[PDB]
């Protein structure tokens, strides 16, 4: 009886979960950057 | 916005003596082209 059930199946791949990681990495890594330089955010602009 | 100013000063400051070496340049041009027999500087 599945045959005329079970729903529609998604190939679905979290690879959006994958892209956010990574720009927070490199949000952190540019921070980081930033303060051993001793050049802040806000003493940019 | 200061900050962010003194980021593209160096921009600004390169093309300001830019500006002023132009100046010189048509400085003496003028200085040469007076001694051309041309009424427009009198």
């Given at each position: 009886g599945a045959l005329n059930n079970a729903?529609?199946?998604?190939?679905?791949?979290?690879?959006?979960?994958?892209?956010?990681?990574?720009?927070?990495?490199?949000?952190?890594?540019?921070?980081?950057?930033?303060?051993?330089?001793?050049?802040?955010?806000?003493?940019?602009? | 916005?200061?900050?962010?100013?003194?980021?593209?000063?160096?921009?600004?400051?390169?093309?300001?003596?830019?500006?002023?070496?132009?100046?010189?340049?048509?400085?003496?041009?003028?200085?040469?082209?007076?001694?051309?027999?041309?009424?427009?500087?009198?």
């Open positions: 729903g529609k199946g998604m190939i679905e791949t979290n690879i959006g979960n994958y892209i956010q990681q990574q720009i927070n990495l490199l949000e952190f890594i540019k921070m980081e950057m930033a303060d051993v330089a001793g050049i802040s955010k806000q003493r940019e602009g | 916005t200061l900050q962010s100013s003194h980021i593209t000063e160096w921009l600004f400051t390169i093309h300001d003596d830019v500006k002023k070496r132009a100046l010189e340049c048509f400085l003496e041009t003028a200085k040469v082209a007076l001694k051309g027999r041309n009424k427009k500087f009198q």
